[PDB]
Amino acid sequence: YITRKLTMKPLVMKRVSNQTGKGKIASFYALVVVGDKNGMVGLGEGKSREEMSKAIFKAHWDAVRNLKEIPRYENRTIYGDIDFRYHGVKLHLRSAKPGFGLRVNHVIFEICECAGIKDLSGKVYKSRNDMNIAKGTIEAFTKAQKTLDEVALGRGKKLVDVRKVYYS
Amino acid sequence: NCLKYSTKCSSFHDMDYFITKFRDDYGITPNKQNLTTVIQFYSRKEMTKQAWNTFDTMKFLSTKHFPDICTYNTMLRICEKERNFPKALDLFQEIQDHNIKPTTNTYIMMARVLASSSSNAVVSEGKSDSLRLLGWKYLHELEDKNLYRHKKDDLNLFLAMMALAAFDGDIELSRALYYLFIAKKYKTLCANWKGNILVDQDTIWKSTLMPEMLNYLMLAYARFDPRNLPVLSGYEKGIELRRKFLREFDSSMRLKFKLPFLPISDLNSEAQVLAESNAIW
Amino acid sequence: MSLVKLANTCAHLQNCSKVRVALTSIPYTKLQLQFAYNLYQQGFLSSLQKGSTMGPDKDFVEVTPDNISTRRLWVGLKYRDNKPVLSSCKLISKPNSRIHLPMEDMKKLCSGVTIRNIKPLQPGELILVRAHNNIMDINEAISKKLDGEVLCRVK
Amino acid sequence: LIEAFRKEEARLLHKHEYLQKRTKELEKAKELELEKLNKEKSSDLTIMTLDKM
């Protein structure tokens, strides 16, 4: 299941130094996202001294471990707007009409492509770090999103009642 | 007592007369029990909105007026009648939240609400099997603890089970439950009948035949799909319950009074279903 | 009718939800009472009770100017599946900038357009509008063709 | 010019009668709504209720 269905895309690939007394030691950080495009996604991180390949390797395993189900509306978009603050990134994301593109920041684009979020429009305010953007994106996707079924049951209402009325 | 009899005769004018009389001439306003009786009145007249308004007022006025498990059971009955399972579940959560203690009737009424809600995909919101399953789980939670029983609850329990059996199209369970109920009713009446059995056989059978059981059995027949699999088949507690009831029905048939059930545990064809439908009708 | 009192109530419900308190209290005014009733009818609040500052009322008490100062409305909060039903509560119409919308712009708001920099209605959301001293859901306000002031947003 | 003046008077009269008529039919909608309120409160047991409070 895991290899054939999950798709891996590197999001961050960089060199971070830890200057020790003898000299500058340089290691490789990699941040990746694995998603089946069908409502399951996860993020992974890896750190390797000798070659980035090992960093991406451990990142792939870590992403596989943290693979989690993601709420989705019609299997194409978020249930409602998500306004989320994560360690200095402000993500404002909006659900969209069918056929709407992924008109978002690129990091969010790969995350949505991996997780099967077809439709979204969003803006990133305050800091624009890709690392924090990705972490906050997944967190706001899973914590900050509530399914209409769950909302209705928590309110003890039928889906017909909670569903919005059509106006024109 | 006035409101009790007025409900039993469903006289709206008598309700108005008694309530207005007491308030005007006696300074007496309904307490929690009288307001619960008023809710039962509104339920009798199928006036759900007024019943919910009264329930809200019982919560609002004071803690003495605050609903208890009896009023909550009545409200669960209203939820059954409206086939409103999310509200029934939310109410059950409220009884747990307010520390009110459930009773046998609470579990039975929840099971009936879920059984009725699971009738169609439209009313069940596409969770019909899940709702029947949850009703069965509530019946199991009943079976765990003694709670407080009521002389009538036993009957309702059977009906509740049959409801979950009837809406799932489980012919064999419906047949088993129908046979066991009719047999126990007939034997209990005949054992406790003052007159001779033979002369009063008409009255005995009229007492024995409860139309609700017949209607639920025929609903079990109508929803027959050969490819269907019962919800109670999957679970271990469920399969054990099914096995126990089917074994009891089989043994009872193997061992007076007779019913025209065909000599088979299950009906596997439409033709046999039609034959038994005509037989019981 | 203070938007200040209503804002204080909104923040109080938010805080009460975040620390997971089952029962709390709010001022006993008709704006607060109508607000609590509309939240309760929509399933956000478990129950409403009359009471005093000390607690809910044991027996029924008439409301008079003698006891009005200490009267309170005790709202019970719902927590389902380890989450708060009344997750968040906001005021759209601040005391500074008050938003009185005609019916057409309420329809636009319910239909996804942003009017007067108000983020439009969301699926699981509730918006309350006061028209002629009666609080009501925005959908009902549109249904009755009532011009009114949009007050708040509970999600 | 005679035809123009007469037709302009005619359109004004007909239009005003039209608007008045529309309002008079809308009166029917109001009164039937009030009637529907009667049946709403016909089934009332006189106990004070929270919605009424």
XYZ file of C-alpha atoms in Angstrom:
657
model
C 0.000 0.000 0.000
C 2.562 2.487 1.243
C 4.913 2.759 -1.735
C 2.434 2.415 -4.592
C -0.224 4.760 -3.226
C 1.596 7.387 -1.159
C 3.370 10.158 -3.067
C 6.411 11.887 -1.571
C 7.424 15.438 -2.458
C 10.362 17.289 -0.849
C 9.289 20.631 0.606
C 12.498 21.833 2.289
C 16.085 20.836 1.505
C 18.857 22.843 3.106
C 22.263 22.914 4.783
C 22.407 23.901 8.453
C 25.769 24.370 10.134
C 26.797 23.690 13.729
C 30.172 25.421 13.874
C 32.261 23.394 16.315
C 35.622 24.483 17.692
C 37.682 22.598 15.120
C 35.662 23.778 12.128
C 32.348 24.354 10.438
C 30.324 21.134 10.477
C 27.512 21.167 7.920
C 24.486 18.877 8.030
C 21.472 18.465 5.768
C 17.877 19.122 6.835
C 15.005 17.808 4.740
C 11.271 18.296 5.238
C 8.907 16.189 3.143
C 5.179 15.516 2.878
C 3.604 12.140 2.086
C -0.033 11.911 1.073
C -2.189 9.393 -0.732
C -4.232 12.198 -2.416
C -7.337 10.532 -0.898
C -7.666 12.140 2.530
C -4.486 11.093 4.363
C -1.347 13.213 4.750
C 1.678 13.551 6.991
C 4.880 15.542 7.337
C 8.360 14.251 8.050
C 11.741 15.726 8.901
C 15.250 14.327 8.635
C 18.729 15.489 9.614
C 21.873 13.826 8.257
C 25.520 14.845 8.439
C 27.120 12.903 5.596
C 24.664 13.176 2.670
C 21.200 14.637 2.096
C 19.983 11.271 0.818
C 19.868 9.933 4.373
C 18.097 13.086 5.553
C 15.365 12.613 2.947
C 15.288 8.909 3.849
C 14.553 9.476 7.532
C 12.191 12.298 6.594
C 10.222 9.893 4.406
C 9.914 7.384 7.239
C 8.907 10.120 9.683
C 6.256 11.404 7.285
C 4.941 7.861 6.900
C 4.726 7.538 10.686
C 2.793 10.789 11.198
C 0.435 10.047 8.301
C -3.006 11.116 9.521
C -6.512 11.366 8.136
C -7.464 14.898 7.091
C -11.048 16.253 7.143
C -12.260 17.107 3.643
C -15.453 18.660 2.283
C -16.716 16.813 -0.807
C -13.186 15.331 -0.996
C -12.058 18.558 -2.690
C -11.713 21.389 -0.147
C -11.726 22.490 3.475
C -15.047 22.536 5.308
C -14.924 26.273 5.998
C -12.438 29.086 6.315
C -9.399 28.397 8.473
C -7.656 31.321 10.175
C -4.664 29.960 12.051
C -1.607 31.361 13.830
C 1.464 29.117 14.053
C 4.734 30.378 15.541
C 4.537 33.604 13.558
C 2.779 32.550 10.331
C -0.824 33.651 9.803
C -2.682 31.328 7.429
C -6.018 32.512 6.046
C -7.439 29.732 3.872
C -10.821 29.677 2.139
C -12.820 26.862 0.607
C -13.677 27.355 -3.051
C -16.090 26.421 -5.813
C -15.572 23.184 -7.771
C -13.124 23.776 -10.601
C -11.307 26.456 -8.616
C -7.550 25.935 -8.665
C -5.069 25.749 -5.812
C -4.542 29.506 -5.664
C -2.304 29.420 -2.602
C 1.334 29.718 -1.595
C 3.540 27.092 -3.192
C 4.303 25.125 -0.005
C 0.566 24.934 0.619
C 0.244 23.863 -3.016
C 2.393 20.757 -2.589
C 0.731 19.966 0.743
C -2.744 20.174 -0.805
C -1.668 18.206 -3.878
C -0.333 15.436 -1.646
C -3.401 15.453 0.622
C -6.007 15.658 -2.150
C -7.256 19.187 -1.387
C -8.338 20.138 -4.908
C -9.810 23.569 -4.156
C -8.477 26.341 -1.922
C -7.584 30.033 -1.882
C -5.326 31.385 0.834
C -2.900 34.041 1.986
C 0.105 33.889 4.314
C 0.690 36.918 6.538
C 3.467 37.797 9.005
C 6.407 35.401 8.527
C 6.567 33.361 5.323
C 8.990 30.595 6.337
C 8.323 27.427 4.355
C 9.028 25.287 7.420
C 6.489 27.055 9.612
C 4.083 27.407 6.691
C 4.009 23.643 6.178
C 3.735 22.780 9.864
C 0.979 25.318 10.468
C -0.762 24.233 7.282
C -1.104 20.636 8.439
C -2.028 21.716 11.971
C -4.735 24.091 10.764
C -5.967 21.417 8.371
C -6.540 18.865 11.137
C -7.091 20.792 14.412
C -8.824 23.889 13.045
C -11.291 22.049 10.768
C -14.592 20.524 11.910
C -16.837 18.323 9.790
C -20.419 19.413 9.201
C -21.568 16.023 10.489
C -19.548 16.447 13.679
C -20.781 20.013 14.182
C -24.388 18.919 13.707
C -24.060 15.995 16.123
C -22.386 18.207 18.717
C -25.290 20.628 18.307
C -27.799 17.764 18.215
C -29.178 18.840 14.836
C -29.863 17.111 11.540
C -27.675 17.879 8.538
C -30.672 19.296 6.673
C -31.077 21.974 9.350
C -27.413 22.935 9.732
C -26.837 23.161 5.971
C -26.871 26.726 4.687
C -29.882 28.172 2.882
C -29.535 29.221 -0.762
C -29.917 32.941 -1.476
C -29.699 34.868 -4.740
C -54.488 13.589 38.521
C -56.750 15.947 36.574
C -54.129 16.331 33.851
C -53.483 12.577 33.871
C -57.077 11.723 33.050
C -57.300 14.643 30.610
C -54.307 13.258 28.718
C -55.785 9.774 28.699
C -58.957 11.182 27.118
C -56.996 13.749 25.045
C -59.267 16.660 26.010
C -57.588 19.993 25.249
C -60.516 21.943 26.699
C -60.187 20.038 29.973
C -56.477 20.890 30.138
C -57.274 24.567 29.684
C -60.088 24.471 32.230
C -58.046 22.750 34.936
C -54.851 24.777 34.492
C -56.693 28.100 34.309
C -58.918 27.110 37.238
C -55.956 26.317 39.467
C -53.968 29.418 38.511
C -56.962 31.747 38.826
C -58.688 30.469 41.962
C -56.027 28.532 43.893
C -52.633 30.146 43.266
C -51.374 26.753 42.072
C -48.989 26.599 39.111
C -47.770 23.313 37.571
C -44.675 21.810 39.178
C -42.155 19.480 37.523
C -44.521 16.496 37.573
C -47.486 18.448 36.218
C -45.292 19.998 33.527
C -44.072 16.528 32.560
C -47.709 15.468 32.260
C -48.309 18.526 30.065
C -45.384 17.437 27.881
C -46.993 14.006 27.609
C -50.210 15.752 26.576
C -48.415 17.667 23.836
C -46.777 14.426 22.693
C -50.186 12.718 22.587
C -51.563 15.455 20.317
C -48.404 15.255 18.136
C -47.506 18.851 19.114
C -43.747 18.422 19.293
C -42.804 22.113 19.280
C -44.954 22.909 22.306
C -43.459 19.923 24.132
C -39.932 21.194 23.477
C -40.958 24.674 24.625
C -42.367 23.215 27.846
C -39.175 21.219 28.389
C -37.127 24.390 27.946
C -39.320 26.149 30.510
C -38.891 23.290 32.979
C -35.152 23.835 32.693
C -35.526 27.616 32.895
C -37.841 28.257 35.828
C -36.022 26.658 38.769
C -34.037 23.624 39.856
C -37.129 22.077 41.446
C -38.818 22.385 38.044
C -35.667 21.094 36.350
C -36.309 17.932 34.292
C -35.474 14.536 35.751
C -35.055 11.157 34.090
C -38.812 10.687 33.656
C -39.212 13.880 31.636
C -36.080 12.953 29.691
C -37.641 9.591 28.834
C -40.759 11.385 27.611
C -38.615 13.682 25.485
C -36.832 10.633 24.067
C -40.257 9.298 23.114
C -40.930 12.581 21.315
C -37.610 12.146 19.505
C -38.702 8.652 18.470
C -41.990 9.974 17.114
C -40.127 12.652 15.146
C -37.400 10.157 14.126
C -34.844 12.631 15.481
C -31.822 10.610 16.547
C -29.201 13.415 16.856
C -31.367 15.130 19.451
C -31.935 11.835 21.279
C -28.184 11.204 21.431
C -27.541 14.771 22.575
C -30.182 14.338 25.272
C -28.573 11.108 26.497
C -25.336 13.076 26.724
C -27.206 15.707 28.765
C -28.487 13.104 31.240
C -24.891 11.977 31.647
C -23.672 15.584 31.922
C -26.242 16.775 34.477
C -25.434 13.650 36.587
C -29.047 12.456 36.267
C -29.194 8.684 36.575
C -30.486 6.709 33.555
C -33.078 3.972 33.982
C -34.156 0.932 31.982
C -36.700 3.042 30.115
C -33.989 5.469 29.014
C -32.013 2.728 27.263
C -35.115 1.112 25.762
C -36.381 4.446 24.432
C -32.977 5.256 22.946
C -32.963 1.867 21.225
C -36.440 2.506 19.830
C -35.441 5.984 18.632
C -32.440 4.606 16.764
C -34.459 1.720 15.315
C -37.113 4.081 13.961
C -34.519 6.551 12.674
C -32.773 3.770 10.748
C -35.875 3.069 8.617
C -34.833 4.941 5.454
C -31.602 6.389 4.122
C -33.290 9.800 4.002
C -34.316 9.906 7.662
C -31.167 8.062 8.770
C -28.945 10.524 6.850
C -27.277 7.497 5.275
C -26.250 5.827 8.558
C -29.082 3.288 8.817
C -26.962 0.260 9.695
C -24.934 2.354 12.131
C -28.098 3.547 13.880
C -29.475 0.016 14.223
C -26.068 -1.002 15.561
C -26.092 1.811 18.099
C -29.550 0.837 19.292
C -28.265 -2.691 19.839
C -25.299 -1.288 21.770
C -27.673 0.674 24.003
C -29.628 -2.519 24.663
C -26.368 -4.209 25.664
C -25.565 -1.362 28.058
C -29.024 -1.936 29.517
C -28.247 -5.637 29.917
C -25.125 -4.775 31.918
C -26.714 -3.050 34.933
C -29.872 -3.538 36.995
C -31.034 0.118 36.922
C -34.715 0.634 37.869
C -37.183 -1.605 36.051
C -40.867 -1.012 35.381
C -43.611 -3.578 34.853
C -44.143 -2.321 31.296
C -40.470 -1.929 30.348
C -40.091 -5.651 29.653
C -42.757 -5.501 26.946
C -41.152 -2.423 25.412
C -37.785 -4.174 25.433
C -39.198 -6.951 23.264
C -40.722 -4.377 20.927
C -37.431 -2.486 20.886
C -35.554 -5.628 19.886
C -38.180 -6.399 17.263
C -37.856 -2.859 15.947
C -34.140 -3.384 15.418
C -34.998 -6.783 13.959
C -37.824 -5.481 11.785
C -36.052 -2.552 10.124
C -32.955 -4.629 9.306
C -34.986 -7.209 7.371
C -33.983 -10.019 9.752
C -36.855 -12.412 9.134
C -35.566 -15.217 11.336
C -35.089 -12.995 14.395
C -38.475 -11.363 13.812
C -40.095 -14.799 13.581
C -38.323 -15.989 16.728
C -39.356 -12.906 18.696
C -42.947 -13.094 17.449
C -43.238 -16.754 18.398
C -41.687 -16.281 21.834
C -43.861 -13.261 22.621
C -47.091 -14.905 21.484
C -46.263 -18.141 23.307
C -45.422 -16.452 26.602
C -48.492 -14.202 26.394
C -50.800 -17.133 25.658
C -49.362 -19.337 28.402
C -49.419 -16.516 30.956
C -53.043 -15.667 30.175
C -54.210 -19.290 30.160
C -52.399 -20.007 33.433
C -54.008 -16.913 34.996
C -57.528 -17.081 33.497
C -60.404 -17.417 35.960
C -62.790 -19.157 33.577
C -62.536 -22.351 31.586
C -60.011 -22.146 28.760
C -62.304 -23.444 26.027
C -65.287 -21.104 26.369
C -63.180 -17.930 26.619
C -60.798 -18.939 23.811
C -61.966 -15.932 21.784
C -61.122 -13.486 24.570
C -57.826 -15.261 25.246
C -56.706 -14.983 21.626
C -57.926 -11.387 21.327
C -55.782 -10.550 24.352
C -52.864 -12.566 22.970
C -52.636 -10.923 19.533
C -50.925 -7.573 19.899
C -51.200 -5.824 16.495
C -47.871 -4.057 16.992
C -45.986 -7.368 16.933
C -47.831 -8.411 13.766
C -47.051 -5.097 12.076
C -43.372 -5.305 13.013
C -43.175 -8.897 11.753
C -44.752 -7.922 8.437
C -42.309 -5.024 8.164
C -39.537 -7.568 8.712
C -41.018 -9.586 5.847
C -41.386 -6.612 3.500
C -37.743 -5.526 3.827
C -36.490 -8.957 2.761
C -33.361 -8.829 0.630
C -31.634 -12.208 0.107
C -28.231 -10.526 -0.196
C -28.717 -8.572 3.044
C -26.621 -9.457 6.081
C -27.983 -8.670 9.574
C -26.237 -5.989 11.603
C -26.465 -8.267 14.648
C -24.549 -10.978 12.770
C -21.170 -9.262 12.975
C -20.726 -8.676 16.692
C -19.823 -11.368 19.190
C -22.403 -10.155 21.699
C -24.775 -9.712 18.772
C -24.140 -13.148 17.287
C -24.492 -14.681 20.752
C -27.839 -12.923 21.263
C -29.013 -14.059 17.827
C -27.903 -17.622 18.539
C -29.638 -17.696 21.920
C -32.945 -16.394 20.580
C -32.903 -18.646 17.508
C -32.090 -21.707 19.629
C -34.933 -20.832 22.002
C -37.369 -20.441 19.100
C -36.208 -23.719 17.548
C -36.584 -25.617 20.826
C -40.007 -24.074 21.437
C -41.190 -25.202 17.997
C -39.760 -28.688 18.544
C -41.653 -29.157 21.822
C -52.046 -26.927 23.306
C -51.639 -24.039 20.859
C -50.037 -23.947 17.416
C -48.837 -21.211 15.071
C -48.476 -21.668 11.301
C -44.771 -20.781 11.102
C -43.202 -22.948 8.432
C -40.886 -25.635 9.913
C -37.662 -23.853 8.917
C -35.216 -21.684 10.849
C -34.942 -19.132 8.027
C -36.783 -18.295 4.817
C -34.382 -18.283 1.865
C -36.849 -17.604 -0.976
C -39.495 -15.020 -1.791
C -42.178 -17.676 -2.302
C -41.815 -19.008 1.238
C -41.942 -15.423 2.507
C -45.258 -14.880 0.725
C -46.575 -18.174 2.094
C -45.724 -17.234 5.680
C -47.073 -13.713 5.218
C -50.415 -15.152 4.132
C -50.257 -17.688 6.966
C -49.736 -15.169 9.769
C -52.167 -12.656 8.294
C -28.618 46.689 25.242
C -24.949 47.612 25.557
C -22.688 46.123 22.935
C -20.100 46.393 25.713
C -22.075 44.045 27.960
C -22.692 41.699 25.036
C -18.982 41.702 24.172
C -18.148 40.950 27.801
C -20.621 38.074 27.676
C -19.065 36.752 24.464
C -15.569 36.811 25.947
C -16.888 35.187 29.123
C -18.404 32.290 27.171
C -15.171 31.885 25.207
C -13.096 31.756 28.393
C -15.563 29.403 30.082
C -15.320 27.049 27.107
C -11.516 27.120 27.026
C -11.243 26.042 30.682
C -14.130 23.570 30.318
C -16.606 24.808 32.929
C -20.023 23.166 32.751
C -22.139 25.973 34.248
C -21.557 29.729 34.253
C -23.559 32.949 34.501
C -24.259 36.103 32.504
C -26.127 39.360 33.172
C -29.913 38.996 33.271
C -30.941 41.502 30.605
C -33.318 41.009 27.696
C -30.489 41.262 25.177
C -28.550 38.607 27.090
C -31.680 36.493 27.554
C -32.586 36.621 23.852
C -28.963 35.849 22.968
C -28.852 32.858 25.300
C -32.183 31.583 23.997
C -31.061 31.818 20.372
C -27.800 30.030 21.165
C -29.710 27.381 23.122
C -32.341 26.732 20.445
C -29.499 26.147 17.979
C -27.887 23.591 20.301
C -24.860 25.620 21.397
C -25.836 25.860 25.086
C -27.023 22.888 27.126
C -29.570 24.743 29.255
C -30.719 28.100 30.604
C -31.677 28.617 34.249
C -32.748 31.597 36.315
C -30.657 32.454 39.324
C -28.840 34.893 41.561
C -25.162 35.762 41.803
C -24.634 32.867 44.215
C -26.195 30.280 41.914
C -29.290 29.011 40.118
C -32.662 29.575 41.752
C -34.060 26.712 43.818
C -37.703 27.809 43.577
C -39.373 30.221 41.193
C -38.750 33.886 42.002
C -40.597 36.863 40.582
C -38.453 39.500 38.870
C -38.830 42.880 40.586
C -36.621 45.967 40.901
C -35.858 44.820 44.455
C -33.878 41.758 43.326
C -32.978 42.801 39.767
C -29.463 43.907 40.717
C -28.372 40.412 41.781
C -30.309 38.444 39.143
C -28.237 36.281 36.798
C -28.871 33.921 33.888
C -27.044 30.614 34.324
C -26.037 28.983 31.048
C -24.810 25.398 30.851
C -22.112 24.680 28.289
C -21.877 21.642 26.007
C -18.663 19.667 25.506
C -18.953 16.799 23.026
C -16.234 14.296 22.099
C -13.650 16.200 24.151
C -14.336 19.401 22.199
C -16.381 22.526 22.991
C -19.621 22.892 21.048
C -19.463 26.688 21.436
C -15.875 26.902 20.263
C -15.712 30.642 19.531
C -17.844 33.782 19.798
C -17.221 37.210 18.259
C -18.964 40.572 17.827
C -19.327 41.724 14.227
C -20.761 45.126 15.214
C -18.250 46.747 17.538
C -19.445 49.598 19.782
C -17.327 51.979 17.688
C -18.374 50.806 14.227
C -21.945 49.535 14.286
C -23.154 47.595 11.246
C -26.808 48.077 10.289
C -27.436 46.123 7.099
C -30.473 46.154 4.790
C -31.986 42.847 3.773
C -30.215 42.722 0.398
C -26.772 42.940 2.004
C -27.724 40.254 4.513
C -28.575 38.028 1.554
C -25.211 38.918 0.016
C -23.453 38.036 3.278
C -25.276 34.711 3.507
C -24.390 34.091 -0.157
C -20.623 34.521 0.320
C -19.967 38.201 -0.433
C -18.009 40.422 1.961
C -20.037 43.545 2.795
C -18.567 46.334 4.932
C -15.504 44.138 5.505
C -17.575 41.430 7.209
C -16.387 37.918 6.476
C -19.446 36.136 5.031
C -21.436 33.372 6.662
C -19.743 29.976 6.989
C -21.444 26.552 6.905
C -21.448 25.582 10.594
C -21.689 29.201 11.719
C -24.407 31.274 13.390
C -24.974 35.016 12.901
C -27.447 36.988 15.020
C -29.243 40.154 13.904
C -31.259 42.498 16.113
C -34.295 44.004 14.399
C -36.656 46.341 16.259
C -35.364 45.151 19.664
C -35.730 41.421 18.844
C -32.722 39.159 18.346
C -33.057 36.519 15.651
C -30.993 34.313 13.387
C -29.893 36.066 10.206
C -31.735 33.483 8.105
C -34.996 34.237 9.906
C -34.343 37.975 9.630
C -34.089 37.532 5.863
C -37.181 35.314 5.952
C -39.154 38.135 7.600
C -37.686 40.866 5.339
C -36.537 42.776 8.426
C -33.838 45.431 8.276
C -31.567 45.131 11.280
C -28.206 45.442 12.940
C -25.842 42.499 12.640
C -24.418 41.833 16.100
C -22.296 38.717 16.464
C -20.838 35.503 15.093
C -20.620 32.250 17.067
C -18.914 29.290 15.412
C -50.074 65.989 -30.020
C -53.616 65.209 -28.844
C -52.845 61.489 -28.942
C -49.568 61.997 -27.082
C -51.142 63.973 -24.238
C -54.060 61.574 -23.848
C -51.820 58.497 -23.881
C -49.444 59.985 -21.318
C -52.343 60.714 -18.970
C -53.612 57.175 -19.563
C -50.285 55.523 -18.751
C -49.941 57.538 -15.544
C -53.451 56.604 -14.385
C -53.049 52.921 -15.248
C -49.633 52.721 -13.574
C -50.894 54.294 -10.354
C -53.860 51.925 -10.245
C -51.424 49.054 -10.836
C -49.205 49.949 -7.871
C -52.224 50.459 -5.621
C -53.592 47.076 -6.682
C -50.308 45.318 -5.885
C -50.306 46.789 -2.383
C -53.927 45.743 -1.864
C -53.121 42.130 -2.758
C -50.088 42.239 -0.449
C -52.598 43.080 2.285
C -54.030 39.594 1.733
C -50.630 38.045 2.427
C -50.345 40.028 5.655
C -53.816 39.017 6.846
C -53.299 35.333 6.011
C -50.028 35.441 7.949
C -51.936 36.859 10.915
C -54.455 34.035 10.503
C -51.616 31.506 10.552
C -50.583 33.045 13.873
C -54.044 32.205 15.238
C -53.632 28.486 14.546
C -50.147 28.705 16.046
C -51.616 29.958 19.337
C -54.906 28.054 19.076
C -52.985 25.083 20.509
C -51.740 26.757 23.681
C -52.270 25.530 27.242
C -51.808 29.030 28.773
C -48.651 28.098 30.725
C -45.985 30.752 30.396
C -43.340 29.610 27.927
C -39.739 30.611 27.360
C -40.294 31.860 23.812
C -43.066 34.064 25.193
C -40.868 35.347 28.037
